[PDB]
Design a protein around this ligand. Sequence first.
Ligand SMILES: C[C@H](CS(N)(=O)=O)c1ccccc1
Length: 185
Amino acid sequence: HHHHHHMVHITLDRNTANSWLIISKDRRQVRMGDTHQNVSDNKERFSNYPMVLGAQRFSSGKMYWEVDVTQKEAWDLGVCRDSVQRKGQFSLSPENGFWTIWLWQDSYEAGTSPQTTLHIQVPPCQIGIFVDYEAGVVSFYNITDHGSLIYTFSECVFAGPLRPFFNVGFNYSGGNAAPLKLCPL
Ligand SMILES: C[C@H](CS(N)(=O)=O)c1ccccc1
């Protein structure tokens, strides 16, 4: 892919974060805390899962960013509608306004309904996410493996502004404490 020149500077929006997340001062890193992080509740916060949105909203054009997933056992990454449900249980699917991939229990899967098996030969330490709003495209690239394609959602019905989407995952095992990091341009 030659998508790097659509690079955008993504920062995390503290106000959307699950109350157990810790977002770094520079708003470029997020990790699961050991407890509630002493913030007030609000209608923006994801209640049931360790999720947070980027601050940026996209309604046109081509956008690209990269995320470091080094040493994590579980995570979800991609984009979602600004209007996604925040409270209670829900599945990550395009019908619910999410275009995502994830790692769970040693397998990679795309957030279709039902979910799709990914075929990755080189476990990625960094993921590239490309959105073409007009084309209706969300693509994922394996930066560790020379930028190889992971998955393309096409014919996407965004149906509103999009936000970068993150899930640091649970840490029940004690092996998933590591942060998600937005990598420099
Ligand atoms: C209780 C856990 C923390 S952990 N480390 O994943 O066990 C949890 C926190 C926030 C949202 C959902 C779940």
